[PDB]
Design a protein around this ligand. Structure first.
Ligand SMILES: CCCCCCCCCCCCCC(=O)SCCNC(=O)CCNC(=O)[C@@H](O)C(C)(C)COP(=O)(O)O
Ligand code: SF4
Ligand code: SF4
Ligand code: SF4
Ligand code: FES
Lengths: 262, 96, 48, 208, 364, 112, 94, 176, 112, 117
């Protein structure tokens, strides 16, 4: 029972229950996101998915709003752009100036979305917050000061990994992600939180400081550690293998690889 | 310069000009190498309010070219522009 | 320094005859100038 | 107001659009599309057979006196069947305006030389032939300029590697400069700089 | 092909300095591509930088700040003075004058000092960039430019005294290299080559680019289309450049020197070191660069050697898809054969000099 | 399809024959002028090899384009536009022989 | 700056040519350029600043002449907070 | 808007004709050029006595690259590789590993002074003012290999020239 | 009577009005042979008739030059000759006919 | 049956011994953006890279090591490869399959989709 909705005036037929963001994907528009991962559950905390629906006073989160018949999604209206700029400013208000030394630098969703949907200057005239780093294991190098509380790691650990050890402690601006205790996040799919993290809060310890994204040459290959046959991308620079990244194959491995493969 | 008066007179007469007034070599007239520290002004966009980037986003205001005619689907003659106006001889020195 | 001379000759250096175990009475080079005096010599600063 | 953004001149836009329609009406046999860019530049798209007719029309005063060939060049887009896009830039001093005429060709399809109409396209067409693979028919003298006398490949072609396939060195055995296969001491590091996020929604191509 | 001392056929072979610039540009970002234009015409680097900057700005739909524009016009005229000095003096050297070479090259050294003070490079600076100018003028430079310009008139007058009315110099150039106005237009000539023949066309007046609409100057026009008339035009153009320099010195505006948009022009060092947005934009600008909206443009300026144009096409990425450089010397060297007919070897040397050909431009 | 110079393969073959004739007669003049140390027969054998390289072509337009390139090279060689280095570049003298059997390739390097 | 068994001066990177390696020939009648000052030793020598606030900011000194300003959390008593750029160490008193 | 060079008609009066005949026969204009050269002979020469006298330079001069340190002595560069990205001639090769102290430092920083174009980039890009083209320009070498600098060579250059480099940066840091 | 046109290679025409009348009449005669519905014919006839009317109306060369806005009148006669030649070639080309061929599917798509 | 191989000037070894891969690049899993996955890409086979003795820089002898081409459609890339006489391997485009997302499911009364946090 496909219903008709409009994205910037273009008719697109979507099944009922489709999120606004998914219809925008149907017409090709990629709504900016920070907390929404299609594999994971919807959370609606990034607030970057706030888009304006025609004749609706209040903007809605595309990731969490099911479409209604006859809705016109204005993805580039002034309200949508202003909401995106405000959310980006709030995200970058406390974020540390770690881009040159952050391993995520060059492949950071925060950086790119700031360059594309955010302001080019900062009005923040106060001190930034700092968070003590947590140790979650020998694989994931953690700098929580860079975290944006997107909650991707938590939801991933709960749903895909199945290990309910990562959670949010505190309230308000002092809210911190991570084990309240000195527990170590151990799982086969533990390394995938590095990939899932938009910011360089969670990064690969063996890969740390080794190379920058633009240098690397990407070669698409298949892993041999297991008989699953996960598709991987072998990132090589100057003839040396630098890291192994998952490659999407919905039938075999959705977007994940084992720790041994990684 | 440090030239004697005789040499200055000789060089000036040979030139037909007073070389002493305009000397190619540079003397104390040059600016001091060390200068007081500068304070460069900020631009128009350095504001704390009403400065949303959407208003001043030049790149996003560019659009694909408008198609005047496409083969794949009296009137007055027109020119690419009004004809150029003839230049006027310069008042300061019409003929060199 | 002779400020009376025109710019470019107002400052000059007489290289030492011996530096770093090398006889520099005849063979002199620009690199012999130490960095502190280099900026004064090349007019990068007016303060010696 | 809006100091950052470039000012827009609509009058020139309207004038160029009207003149483009004029040209489209006068020679419907060859013109396929005429468009005016929002920075006030007019482009007329022509079938390859119309290079000489339309250029001659533009030079001679049918209210158009484009008597100076600004530059002649090609853009190699491999995706299109006619991978080469021959580009003509003309300037009219009487009307202090410039328009651009663009045509397409293949590696194996010649295009008529424009030496007759303009006479400044001799070296430009020679350069196009030397860099790109386009051959201009009826050219007074088509030969290589800007490449070595024995150069085999056609550079600027998006297929030719930046370093080429051959390298020159002096060899004492033969007392001569000899070509050899390229062997770079430091491989040119290919940087993947394009961002995964769309920058200009105005130019979003249809999903198809 | 010389019968006796007469050139029956003059065939120019070029590419001895072809460095594949246009190919290399495709593999660089626009900011990385800017330094090539300094190299393209070694005598007139900043003019080429300005042409590329205008191209990228027009494609970018971004407007340089007014102070940047006035700095650009001032240094464009300084560059024109340098280029004309080199052209006129080396032409004189090739026909044997030799002394004005050194006389005017002292002034060239001083103008190189101005370049060094603004950018740190005596030549091939990266001062003029898309979005404006890299750094504001160091304090005290403008008055030094005033000191230089107030005396440059005597130097150019001395050059005229040496050459303008000399019987030998006139005999070497009075009627050599004559080009008909229609032939000059057809062969694609630009700049003095056109104006020497008597056609009245200067892109600075006809299609002003930055702030030339706000300055007053007279376009020198010749009457016989010869080398001597081109010499007269070049000398006068230098004088008019001095006039433009005075005007620009008097009315330099206060304010920013680069566009106040951190998505195109890099943020200030203090701001990038203190604000997260500024650091993010600095990182992306100096690693990926600024994406240019897809499109194509041919932007032309009245470069000191003629019309300099860049046909820049963008695919929406941070690296230009195709960049074609229109060098004014290309067409002049093409028409060299037509000019040389009926002349002797020495006349061929003179004609080569009159077409101010820099083979970096010709070969690219 | 628009013909470059020949509407049929036969006409292109005629043009090839002319080009071969011209190269053949030019070879001794090339040897004399460029002071090359090769024999005339050696050069003509190289000419034959170069011509047979393009023999597999089965399209008239490609043949015509190759003929144009051959004519341009011949004009360069007839004039002194090409230097002795350019003329000898056909003879890959400096380059070491590259073995073609599988076992030699396996020994030498990873190249396929 | 330690000396390798071959007699070469090991670099701050730890680079030293092994006795088997033939690349040591390049220093046969010339010298191997090694910077005597080692960054790790000098950064170790710096005293640890004691600040009474939970979060402190290091600009590297000189303001705009240093490094981007970052805020360091000093809650952990066990380990001193270290500047990512400057490398200076801070800890809360007691 | 336009000015006519040439386009002047000589007077035909007997005095003007006599003057021009005198110029042709008595070589007046040649004598004027000779007098100009004589005056330049009596003018002071512009030569500076290199190497004892050096040409003027500004604080923004772009010369030999030199890696700088913090006042503590720790090397400033933090392995951002931003310089390698902006490098318009790919003359910068950077390799990094976490050092024993755990800081992000460069195991390899090579600047091929034979491929670098002395553009001034990197100096304006490095977020920590690490690579800074020094004031030195007279660093010619007798072999090509000497111009392929290494991280040790760059750090030695920085240590050698830091006294001048810090002063030049202090002079110019406000303009940047 | 002006001493010189000011542009080299262009000579002052002693009888400009008569030359212009003859050229415009010849242009109209050539345009007559062009089919009636051809846009070229209509527009060129409009311009030529306007120019001819101005030429006949004004007897003073300077006033005619000011009215025509075509530069110096010698440039006008040169432009008229160029128009005559264009019209003569247009008769052969027949540009008024429909488009020869539609371009390929995406021959003018940018970005790719 | 178009063949430009003779006209390209490419030496025979790279014409015959190189396998070119036609594909749509997969999204860099580090980022959620998908703009870099909308155009087909042609990439040549990787070859040997060795360290320079002097400086340790990676040296190559493959001229086409860095050559990559962008094509709008698979057929255009295939046609280009065929006209250039390069052996080609085509990897079919991988598209994310449609997913059913419900924020309500996070608070299911009886289903296991309920989220603990
Ligand atoms: C020093 C010596 C330098 C040698 C240089 C000689 C050259 O430039 S080779 C250029 C000649 N290229 C051609 O003739 C292309 C011919 N293309 C063809 O397809 C022909 O082989 C045909 C049409 C199949 C006829 O083949 P046959 O000649 O009957 O078999
Ligand atoms: S994670 Fe934060 S610090 Fe790291 S690159 Fe992204 S925005 Fe910069
Ligand atoms: S650590 Fe990373 S994945 Fe987890 S909430 Fe913070 S930003 Fe998200
Ligand atoms: S100055 Fe030299 S080393 Fe520095 S970025 Fe420019 S080219 Fe690279
Ligand atoms: S991620 Fe979409 S609302 Fe937060």
């Amino acid at each position: 029972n496909l219903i008709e909705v409009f994205v910037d005036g273009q008719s697109v037929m979507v099944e009922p229950g489709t999120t606004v963001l998914q219809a925008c994907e149907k017409v090709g528009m990629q709504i900016p996101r920070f907390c929404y991962h299609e594999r994971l559950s919807v959370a609606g905390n990034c607030r970057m998915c706030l888009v304006e629906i025609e004749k609706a006073p209040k903007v809605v989160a595309a990731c969490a709003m099911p479409v209604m018949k006859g809705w016109n999604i204005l993805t580039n209206s002034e309200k949508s752009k202003k909401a995106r700029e405000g959310v980006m400013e709030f995200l970058l208000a406390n974020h540390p100036l770690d881009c040159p030394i952050c391993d995520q630098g060059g492949e950071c969703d925060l950086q790119d979305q700031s360059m594309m949907f955010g302001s080019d200057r900062s009005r923040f005239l106060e001190g930034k917050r700092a968070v003590e780093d947590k140790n979650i294991g020998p694989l994931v190098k953690t700098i929580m000061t860079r975290c944006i509380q997107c909650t991707r790691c938590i939801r991933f650990a709960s749903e895909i990994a199945g290990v309910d050890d990562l959670g949010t402690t505190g309230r308000g601006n002092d809210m911190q992600v991570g084990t309240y205790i000195e527990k170590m996040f151990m799982s086969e799919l533990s390394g995938n939180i590095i990939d899932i993290c938009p910011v360089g809060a969670l990064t690969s310890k063996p890969y740390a400081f080794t190379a920058r994204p633009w240098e690397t040459r990407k070669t698409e290959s298949i892993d041999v550690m297991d008989a699953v046959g996960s598709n991987i991308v072998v990132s090589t620079r100057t003839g040396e293998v630098m890291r192994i990244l998952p490659r999407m194959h919905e039938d075999i491995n959705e977007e994940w690889i084992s720790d041994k493969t990684r | 310069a440090s030239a004697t008066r005789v040499i200055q007179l000789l060089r000036n007469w040979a030139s037909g000009r007073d070389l002493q007034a305009k000397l190619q070599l540079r003397y104390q007239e040059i600016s001091k190498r060390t200068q007081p520290p500068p304070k460069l002004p900020v631009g128009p966009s350095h504001k704390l309010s009403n400065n949303y980037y959407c208003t001043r986003d030049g790149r996003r205001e560019a659009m694909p070219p408008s198609i005047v005619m496409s083969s794949q689907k009296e009137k007055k003659a027109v020119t690419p522009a009004p004809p150029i106006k003839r230049w006027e001889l310069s008042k300061d020195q019409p003929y060199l | 320094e002779d400020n009376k001379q025109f710019f470019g000759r107002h400052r000059w250096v007489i290289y030492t005859t011996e530096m770093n175990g090398r006889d520099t009475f005849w063979d002199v080079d620009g690199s012999m100038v130490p960095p502190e005096w280099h900026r004064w010599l090349h007019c990068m600063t007016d303060d010696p | 107001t809006r100091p950052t953004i470039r000012p827009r001149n609509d009058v020139v836009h309207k004038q160029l659009s009207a003149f483009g329609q004029y040209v489209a009406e006068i020679l419907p046999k060859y013109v396929q599309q005429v468009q005016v860019s929002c920075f006030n530049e007019l482009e007329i798209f022509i079938h390859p057979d119309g290079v000489i007719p339309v250029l001659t029309f533009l030079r001679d005063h049918t209210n158009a006196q484009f008597k100076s060939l600004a530059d002649l060049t090609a853009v190699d887009v491999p995706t299109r069947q006619n991978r080469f896009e021959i580009v003509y830039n003309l300037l009219s001093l009487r009307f202090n305006s410039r328009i651009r005429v663009k045509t397409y060709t293949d590696e194996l399809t010649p295009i008529e030389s424009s030496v007759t109409v303009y006479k400044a396209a001799n070296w430009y067409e020679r350069e196009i032939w030397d860099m790109f693979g386009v051959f201009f028919a009826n050219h007074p003298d088509l030969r290589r300029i800007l490449t070595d006398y024995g150069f085999e490949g056609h550079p600027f072609r998006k297929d030719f590697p930046l370093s080429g396939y051959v390298e020159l060195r002096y060899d004492d055995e033969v007392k001569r400069v000899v070509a050899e296969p390229v062997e770079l001491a430091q491989e040119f590091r290919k940087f993947d700089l394009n961002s995964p996020w769309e920058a200009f929604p105005a130019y979003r191509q249809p999903p198809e | 092909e010389l019968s006796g001392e007469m050139v029956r056929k003059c065939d120019p072979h070029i590419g001895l300095l072809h460095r594949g610039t246009e190919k290399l540009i495709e593999y660089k970002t626009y900011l990385q591509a800017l330094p090539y234009f300094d190299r393209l015409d070694y005598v007139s680097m900043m003019c080429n930088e300005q042409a590329y900057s205008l191209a990228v700005e027009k494609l970018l739909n971004i407007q340089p700040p007014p102070r940047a524009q006035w700095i650009r016009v001032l240094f464009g005229e300084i560059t024109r003075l340098l280029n004309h000095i080199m052209a006129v003096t080396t032409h004189a050297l090739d026909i044997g004058a030799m002394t004005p070479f050194f006389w005017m090259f002292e002034e060239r050294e001083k103008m190189f000092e101005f370049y060094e003070r603004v950018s740190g490079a005596r030549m091939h600076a990266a001062y003029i960039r898309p979005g404006g100018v890299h750094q504001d003028l160091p304090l005290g430079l403008l008055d030094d430019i005033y000191e230089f310009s107030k005396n440059f008139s005597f130097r150019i007058d001395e050059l005229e005294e040496m050459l303008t009315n000399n019987r030998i110099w006139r005999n070497r150039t009075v009627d050599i290299g004559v080009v008909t106005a229609e032939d000059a237009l057809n062969y694609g000539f630009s700049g003095v080559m056109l104006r020497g023949s008597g056609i009245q066309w200067d892109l600075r007046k006809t299609q002003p680019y930055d702030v030339y609409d706000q300055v007053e100057f007279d376009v020198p026009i010749g009457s016989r289309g010869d080398c001597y008339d081109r010499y007269l035009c070049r000398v006068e153009e230098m004088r008019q450049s001095l006039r433009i320099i005075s005007q620009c010195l008097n009315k330099m505006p206060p304010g920013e020197i680069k566009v106040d948009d951190a998505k195109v022009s890099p943020p200030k060092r203090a701001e990038m070191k203190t604000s997260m947005e500024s650091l993010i934009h600095h990182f992306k600008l100096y690693t990926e660069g600024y994406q240019v909206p897809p499109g194509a443009t041919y932007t032309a300026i009245e470069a000191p050697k003629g019309e300099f144009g860049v046909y820049l096409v963008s695919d929406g990425s941070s690296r230009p898809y195709r960049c074609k450089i229109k060098a004014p010397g290309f067409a002049h060297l093409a028409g060299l054969d037509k000019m040389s007919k009926g002349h002797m070897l020495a006349d061929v040397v003179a004609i080569i000099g009159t077409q101010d050909i820099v083979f970096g431009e010709v070969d690219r | 399809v628009k013909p470059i110079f020949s509407r049929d393969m036969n006409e292109a073959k005629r043009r090839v024959r002319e080009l071969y004739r011209a190269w053949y007669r030019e070879v001794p003049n090339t040897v004399h002028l460029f002071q090359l140390d090769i024999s005339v027969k050696q050069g003509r054998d190289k000419v034959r090899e170069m011509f047979m390289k393009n023999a597999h072509v089965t399209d008239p337009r490609v043949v015509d384009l190759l003929v144009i390139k051959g004519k341009m090279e011949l004009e360069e060689t007839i004039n002194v536009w090409k230097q002795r280095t350019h003329i000898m570049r056909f003879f890959h003298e400096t380059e070491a022989p590259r073995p073609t059997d599988f076992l030699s390739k396996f020994y030498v390097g990873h190249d396929p | 700056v330690r000396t390798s068994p071959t007699g070469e001066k090991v670099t701050h990177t730890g680079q030293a040519y092994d006795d088997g390696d033939y690349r040591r020939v390049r220093f046969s009648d010339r010298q191997k350029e090694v910077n005597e000052n080692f960054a790790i030793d000098l950064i170790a020598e710096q005293p640890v600043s004691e600040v009474g606030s939970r979060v402190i900011s290091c600009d590297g000194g000189g303001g705009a002449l240093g490094h981007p300003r970052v805020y360091i959390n000093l809650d952990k008593e066990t380990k001193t907070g270290t500047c990512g750029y400057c490398g200076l160490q801070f800890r809360q008193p007691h | 808007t336009y000015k006519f060079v040439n386009m002047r008609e000589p007077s035909m009066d007997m005095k003007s004709v006599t003057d021009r005949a005198a110029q042709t026969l008595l070589w007046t204009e040649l004598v004027r050029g000779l007098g100009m050269t004589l005056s330049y002979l009596f003018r002071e020469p512009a030569t500076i006595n290199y190497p004892f006298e050096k040409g003027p330079l500004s604080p923004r001069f772009r010369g030999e690259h030199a890696l700088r340190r913090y006042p503590s002595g720790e090397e400033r560069c933090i392995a951002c590789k931003l310089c390698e990205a902006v490098c318009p001639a790919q003359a910068i090769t950077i390799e990094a590993e976490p050092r024993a102290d755990g800081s992000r430092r460069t195991t390899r920083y090579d600047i091929d002074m034979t491929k670098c174009i002395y553009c001034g980039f990197c100096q304006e890009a490095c977020p920590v003012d690490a690579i800074v083209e020094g004031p030195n320009f007279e660093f010619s070498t007798e072999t090509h290999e000497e111009l392929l600098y290494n991280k040790e060579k760059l750090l030695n250059n920085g240590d050698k020239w830091e006294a001048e480099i810090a002063a030049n940066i202090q002079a110019d840091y406000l303009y940047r | 009577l002006k001493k010189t046109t000011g542009l080299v290679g262009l000579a002052v025409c002693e009888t400009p009005h008569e030359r212009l009348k003859i050229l415009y009449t010849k242009i109209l005669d050539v345009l007559g042979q062009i089919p009636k519905n051809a846009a070229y014919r209509k527009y060129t006839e409009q311009i030529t008739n306007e120019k001819l009317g101005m030429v006949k109306a004004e007897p003073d060369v300077k006033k005619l030059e000011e009215q025509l806005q075509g530069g110096q009148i010698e440039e006008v006669i040169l432009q008229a000759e160029n128009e005559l030649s264009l019209a003569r070639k247009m008769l052969r080309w027949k540009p008024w006919e429909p488009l020869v061929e539609e371009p390929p599917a995406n021959q003018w798509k940018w970005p790719i | 049956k178009l063949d430009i191989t003779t006209l390209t000037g490419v030496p025979e070894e790279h014409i015959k011994t190189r396998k070119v891969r036609i594909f749509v690049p997969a999204r860099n899993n580090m980022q959620s953006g998908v703009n870099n996955t909308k155009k087909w890409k042609m990439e040549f086979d990787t070859r040997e890279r060795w360290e320079n003795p002097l400086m340790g820089w990676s040296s190559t002898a493959d001229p086409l090591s860095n050559l990559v081409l962008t094509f709008s459609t698979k057929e255009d890339a295939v046609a280009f490869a065929e006209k250039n006489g390069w052996s080609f391997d085509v990897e079919e485009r991988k598209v994310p399959k449609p997913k059913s997302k419900s924020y309500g499911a996070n608070f299911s009364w009886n289903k296991r989709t309920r989220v603990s946090t």
